[PDB]
């Protein structure tokens, strides 16, 4: 690995620099390098890892959607034949996206998840596992679409089980997990009623626990609650 020769602390320092410079591919490579040092990650370090890869895959997802839409339009009546280029280029972007997802899932499997024993770490990593299977599901169109969906669901469910046992209802990791699992249900699993039910229950139980929080923790929880509400407005 190209980062094998760089100190862990230096990789973290450079990931932060790359974040400031909006160099997210670099940021991801630095954080991969840090993970591969084999030490567990702190809360802040998990955040750097998450930000880096979310930005990389987010660019890929946006591009894939543009290309898929062009492709879909070319495969209708009245549409002039234009050769294999749109499909080829969509496939190229798709393959790169799957590559990034497989890299993240590889880090989680080797060995972030198994070493994570605290609730905050374990729930964060399992959420991440669900998210990156979800991204794979967005582009899957084969035998394995079903199995990918089940992998995402399994990761999210395991995370949900721990979060409900171990964290308060306002915990931001717990809230973001529930938000993303509700998106999984609505957008991937064709279960809009499960999506709405989860979003409603999560919102209501968080609302009732806000009183326990400091002003700063309150700010964090209510941010995610607003997104649950925005989705509920969208979905109903």
């Amino acid at each position: 690995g190209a980062m094998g020769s760089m100190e862990r602390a230096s990789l973290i320092q450079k990931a932060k620099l790359a974040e400031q410079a909006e160099r997210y591919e670099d940021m991801a490579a630095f954080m991969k390098g840090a993970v591969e040092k084999g030490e567990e990650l702190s809360c802040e370090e998990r955040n750097l890892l998450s930000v880096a890869y979310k930005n990389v895959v987010g660019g890929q997802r946006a591009a894939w959607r543009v290309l898929s839409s062009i492709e879909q339009k070319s495969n209708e009546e009245g549409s002039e034949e234009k050769g294999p280029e749109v499909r080829e280029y969509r496939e190229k972007v798709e393959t790169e996206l799957q590559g990034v997802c497989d890299t993240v899932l590889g880090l989680l499997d080797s060995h972030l998840i198994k070493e994570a024993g605290d609730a905050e770490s374990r729930v964060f990593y399992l959420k991440m596992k669900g998210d990156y299977y979800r991204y794979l599901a967005e582009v899957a169109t084969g035998d394995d679409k079903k199995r990918i969906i089940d992998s995402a669901r399994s990761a999210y469910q395991e995370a949900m089980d721990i979060s409900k046992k171990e964290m308060p209802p306002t915990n931001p990791i717990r809230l973001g997990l529930a938000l993303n699992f509700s998106v999984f249900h609505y957008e991937i699993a064709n279960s809009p009623e499960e999506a709405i039910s989860l979003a409603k229950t999560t919102f209501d139980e968080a609302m009732a626990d806000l009183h326990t929080l400091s002003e700063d923790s309150y700010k964090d929880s209510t941010l995610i609650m607003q997104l649950l509400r925005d989705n509920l407005t969208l979905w109903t």
Binding site: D131, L179, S182, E187, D230, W235
Partner: peptide
């Protein structure tokens, strides 16, 4: 319109 998932901090 697509559903909103968790943002970056």
């Amino acid at each position: 319109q697509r559903s909103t998932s968790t943002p970056n901090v």
